[PDB]
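Long-time lurker, first post.

We've been arguing in lab meeting about whether magnesium ion would sit comfortably in this protein at all. Half the group thinks yes, half thinks no, and nobody has a model to point at. So I'm putting the question to the forum: if I give you the sequence and the SMILES, can you give me back a predicted structure of the complex? Inputs are below. Any interpretation is welcome too.
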Amino acid sequence: SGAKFRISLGLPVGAVINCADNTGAKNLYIISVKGIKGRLNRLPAAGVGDMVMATVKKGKPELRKKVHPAVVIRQRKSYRRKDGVFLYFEDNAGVIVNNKGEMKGSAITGPVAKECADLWPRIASNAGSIA
Amino acid sequence: MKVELCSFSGYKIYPGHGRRYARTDGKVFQFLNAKCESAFLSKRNPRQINWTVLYRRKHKKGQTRRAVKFQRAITGASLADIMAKRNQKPEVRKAQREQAIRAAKEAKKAKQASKK
Amino acid sequence: MKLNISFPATGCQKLIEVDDERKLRTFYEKRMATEVAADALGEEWKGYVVRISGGNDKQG
RNA sequence: AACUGCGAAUGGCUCAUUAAAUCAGUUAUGGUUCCUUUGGUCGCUCGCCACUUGGAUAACUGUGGUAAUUCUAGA
RNA sequence: CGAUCGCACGCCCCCCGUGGCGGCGACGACCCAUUCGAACGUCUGCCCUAUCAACUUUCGAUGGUAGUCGCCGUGCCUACCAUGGUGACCACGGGUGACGGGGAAUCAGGGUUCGAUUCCGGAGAGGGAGCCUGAGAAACGGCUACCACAUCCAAGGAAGGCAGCA
RNA sequence: CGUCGCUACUACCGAUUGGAUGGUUUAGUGAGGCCCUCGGAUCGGCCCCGCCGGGGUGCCCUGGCGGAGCGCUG
RNA sequence: CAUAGCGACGUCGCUUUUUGAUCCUUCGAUGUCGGCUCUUCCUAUCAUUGUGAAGCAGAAUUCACCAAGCGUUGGAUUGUU
RNA sequence: CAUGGUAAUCCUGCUCAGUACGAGAGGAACCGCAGGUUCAGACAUUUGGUGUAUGUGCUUGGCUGAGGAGCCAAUGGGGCGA
RNA sequence: UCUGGGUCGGGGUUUCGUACGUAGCAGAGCAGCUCCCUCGCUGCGAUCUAUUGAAAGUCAGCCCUCGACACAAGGGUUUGU
Ligand SMILES: [Mg+2]
Ligand SMILES: [Mg+2]
Ligand SMILES: [Mg+2]
Ligand SMILES: [Mg+2]
Ligand SMILES: [Mg+2]
Ligand SMILES: [Mg+2]
Ligand SMILES: [Mg+2]
Ligand SMILES: [Mg+2]
Ligand SMILES: [Mg+2]
Ligand SMILES: [Mg+2]
Ligand SMILES: [Mg+2]
Ligand SMILES: [Mg+2]
Ligand SMILES: [Mg+2]
Ligand SMILES: [Mg+2]
Ligand SMILES: [Mg+2]
Ligand SMILES: [Mg+2]
Ligand SMILES: [Mg+2]
Ligand SMILES: [Mg+2]
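Top reply:
Settle the argument with this. Predicted structure of the protein with magnesium ion, as tokens:
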């Protein structure tokens, strides 16, 4: 099996990230992170491989005024990968999925973090490359 | 003892050092420190920075004939056979060229006589 | 790692499987068409210098 | 079987684009190119292999890599 | 300014006797002409729209000079100059449920509609763009890159183009 | 004949700095191909000329390993 | 099927996180709402530990006991509680 | 060591197991494994932050006749930085 | 003490990025000098190249010196079962 190790989160609630699928959504506005118990005044933050609730701000009007489950695939904050490498990406990105984990879209633009790849096998198959 | 990486500067990166960059187009770079990384991020050419490996090789800082022929036996003739054929130099080949001349001439003359 | 050792003056190439990285680090970080003395393979390969001519990746 | 030469720029399909554009008739290229066919021309030149020169590569023998492809490497 | 490949096979012999000579081809060629063409030009000709009247001219718009480039002639492009060029005889702009023509339907005459469709010309190969080879391609049952769809994978990669016949 | 009341249908205006799809473009970034100036990982020729060598007679015709000329070049 | 879970007509209490009632202290003045910050305490326990009951088959839930060790969040609107 | 303080917390995934239970739909648990949340105590090997080492380049205006070397602008500004 | 700890110097490490000067038939060019030369030479000129991964800093809370220099058995105040 193997569970995900802790990584630097970097993406709190209120962050707007790119939408890397082809659903017609251009960005995702993160409103919460799944599995976050929280603390007083602490913003729920998400890293790569984290499932979030997000609303698209620009894109198809049929997706706009709704809440979508999403999974972060790229992040601009450097995170240590248990073997020294501090990887970070050119931009924050995520894709729209459902609660089961199936991706609403059918393709992913750009790389996908290895943490997100082996946590969501549905996302990894659609991924063009893994970084 | 892991993979050994090379930077924007071309220096050797040991495990547990530097950072790794993954662009959106799918290319992955690795840097030794923030000096080499920030030079890369400012679209700066490594061939114009005097401490970079790429510069030193461009400006050349600090920086025969072999031929062997062998004889192999081929399918049908051993090396001993081909040695004997090529070692018929002392008038053995001369005997072959003169016996060819007289035999071909006597066959040519007899062929003219065969017709009438 | 497998090695495709071939003798030009006699033919008779053969494939040898090895797993000791100490014997292959004398080959590591070497370009093609370079000759490295392959005396690090056991005891029978003494007096031999061998030239790297090619190879394949993990994916072929 | 492979190297070489030739074809694969024709045919077939469709009508999206395109309103002096395409296209039709007319005229020009004395402002250009043209495989192939066809017919000319190929002793018009004063200049130690020529009774025939050099090296490599296919196919083939053999050792393979990859999960994979009409992928290919080394000898 | 032939180091190429077949077919029958022969003549001269004095210098002799081992050479020189020979026909039918095929292939090959720099150039010329022809043929198939191709490419760009000349004149006349196109549907609706003014709830499109002034457009073009920075970044070429019109012309001149000198070039660059192309297979060639030309603002095709560059530099230096001149301020030109088109329009109520409808420019320019917009639409088209517009590929053009030979043609089709109706039929006194004149006309009114239809021509995606087997012949000719053009264009296009999911949308753009850029090239290799070749005489001829900006080729797509060739390649390269991006975009969009989509394929197999051991997730390290690899492979796409039915507006061809089904 | 018109107002008002009921029922259908059709358009109009209308906050929403509304929405969507084409087309032509300024500016910024910019893959890739082509050209040019370099570059030179490699593969070769000549100068071999450390040697055994030699023939018209050390004055080499050279029959090969190998040194490598550490150069002139494709 | 009164009492797994509820509890009508009635009736007995507890609490001082409501609001009243009163005016004992303070009028030579005890700075008067909320929020933020921070500590501690209570239990009448939402969750977690150990349990009992069901109209508890499993899952989920409901009732009750020991129990306050630990936790009880991020936001739109509103000065707000 | 008298005495005082005192501290750890909860969740998820794999397996158990599509198992027990159930007509079916559905659907656990104990042991074990891998990890997280909140909290606590540290720490600087690495990544990041700072940076007046006023360390070293770049640069504006002015000033020392010019070069060199520097300085002034309340840290002149900016890059990298032990 | 079989010395000591300092101060300089050196080495290492590291930071930045290739110093001044000289040289060049490098350099957009421009201004002068032609019995001259047969294509030449004299200045100004940012920048480039070689010298030169050079120059500069580096414990003050970096590491190792055993190179040089001087200094270190000195001072004061108290303390008794
Ligand atoms: Mg708050
Ligand atoms: Mg149309
Ligand atoms: Mg037609
Ligand atoms: Mg046609
Ligand atoms: Mg075409
Ligand atoms: Mg051809
Ligand atoms: Mg094409
Ligand atoms: Mg009173
Ligand atoms: Mg009273
Ligand atoms: Mg007071
Ligand atoms: Mg008070
Ligand atoms: Mg209680
Ligand atoms: Mg105690
Ligand atoms: Mg200044
Ligand atoms: Mg100065
Ligand atoms: Mg002053
Ligand atoms: Mg900084
Ligand atoms: Mg020192």
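For your lab meeting: Chain B is about 40% helix and 10% strand. Strands of chain B lie at 5-6, 12-13, 19-22, 28-31. Whichever side wins, do check it experimentally.
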